[PDB]
């Protein structure tokens, strides 16, 4: 490989894509490792029932039901807390598609799909940065809150992290950065095969050099690390597994569980979703 | 790039999978282009109702009711020829998988396990190297039957080939050859991510250096195609989503067609998938 004006304007497409990456997400995995280990936050540890609730601060929640089993009550604030986390989150992620170059000028109806289709593989994809073996940061950073609590909830709401866990205990194995991330998170969006899609060639184009722009990130990010492209690639499936397993979930609870209707921007994505 | 001891291995990795490639697939790449364009085939084009039926002798069925609906009976008819055929490229996939360095050495359980989730994902990724605009090869190239035809089967059955077409034609535009697809099959069988497996570090090993492997054959025998690797590993996602809305066509049948078992084998295969 050489440094010629190909490579120094792959380099530049990656350091853009990580100014607004910085512009975009308040807690980057460089600051949430810091706290895993170190910084100015101390977050709280949600570890059982009792320090979920002599810790309140951190969960947002509202309109909460004093007389009902404890069980249901924690599980129901619990949701309400990752909700109100998914919509700040496809905010986040909206503004950073908008420094993509090209994204912008693509047809709107397609900016929408692609957006639509990437946002939940997004947020999964920047959980697990928030993930250690044993939990998840919380709040900004203020709160943490234990794998194996979260897996002890009521049945079904037990079942719903474990999977965004066991992804990113292997995700986080790559050992990538958020100079890496920024340029994965790109090539997420620029998918050519959502449904729906009204010109892919376009799309596809701008992939592409994205693709280009993180394979050489990865080549100069890691060295030593064998096929780090192509099993970071390998990982886009994997994120629409989580994607289809939580939407089954969701059902369950619609379907067996009164009082509780996503936030509007959530219906909007899942309704006609696949 | 080098030619060097390492990737010498790598292209006798290559060539092994391609012998035993074409040990395994007597219907090829090469020998379908060559029909669908000078050959020793000449296939009998179907293309309507009528020549379904002038030409029973390329599709294989039985157990066959004359009193019934004439597009009931044709889809009946085309259904159980893509059963005949599932049935033997399930042996053929097998038969390839056992020439994959390492592979009969995985623990037996994971082994079968990689072929219950691969067997499809590799049909539908070879029936495209059988498939052009027009429609596909059938019957060992004896027939050639239209997409559009398939497409007009009595719903639900003109749903099923429609996603296949789809893909190929885009897949196809990637314009690979069979020492191509030799390697990219086996890539695809040794996925680490599949459901129920017990040791993923040993099939992850061999997949590193298929992906090694593939990546290198890419090179030499597309020149300018650029990041075809990429675009390529991109694929095994959409093949995914095809085996999905596949089982959910076959469930609707199940549920409002009597009279229709699935041999016993693909039972096997279907059970607890996903
Ligand atoms: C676990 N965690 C980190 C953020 O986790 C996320 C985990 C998932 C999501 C995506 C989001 N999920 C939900 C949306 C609405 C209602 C419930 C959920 C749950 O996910 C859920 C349901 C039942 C039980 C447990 C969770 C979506 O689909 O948009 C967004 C964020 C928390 C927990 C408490 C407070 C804040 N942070
Ligand atoms: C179209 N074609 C090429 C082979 O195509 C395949 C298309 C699909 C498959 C996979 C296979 N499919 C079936 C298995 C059992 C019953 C029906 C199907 C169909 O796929 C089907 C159902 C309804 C209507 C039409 C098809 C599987 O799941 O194992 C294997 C082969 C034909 C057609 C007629 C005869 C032979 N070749």
Partial sequence: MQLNPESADLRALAKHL????????????AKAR???????????????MNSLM?????????????????????????????????????????????????????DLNDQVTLLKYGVHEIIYTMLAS???????????????????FLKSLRKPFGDFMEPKFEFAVKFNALELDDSDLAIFIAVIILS????????????????????????????LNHPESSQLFAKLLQKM??????????????????????????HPLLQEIYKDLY
Avoid: W
């Fill in 34 to 48: 810091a706290i895993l280990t170190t910084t100015d936050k101390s977050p709280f540890v949600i570890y059982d």
């Fill in 54 to 106: 002599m810790g309140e601060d951190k969960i947002k929640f509202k309109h909460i039901t004093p007389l009902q089993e404890q069980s249901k009550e924690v599980a129901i604030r619990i949701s309400q807390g990752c909700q109100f986390r998914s919509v700040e989150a496809v905010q986040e992620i909206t503004e950073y598609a908008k420094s993509i170059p090209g994204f912008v000028n693509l």
């Fill in 192 to 219: 050519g095969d959502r449904p729906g899609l009204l010109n892919v060639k376009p799309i596809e184009d701008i992939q592409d050099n994205l693709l280009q722009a993180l394979e050489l990130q990865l080549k």
């Fill in 237 to 262: 499936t994997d994120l629409r597994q989580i994607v289809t397993e939580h939407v089954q979930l969701l059902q369950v609870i619609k379907k067996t569980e009164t009082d509780m209707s996503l």
């Fill in 18 to 29: 990580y100014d607004s990456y910085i512009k975009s997400f308040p807690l980057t995995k």
């Fill in 130 to 148: 928030l993930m250690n073996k044993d939990g998840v940061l919380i709040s900004e950073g203020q709160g943490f809150m234990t794998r194996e």
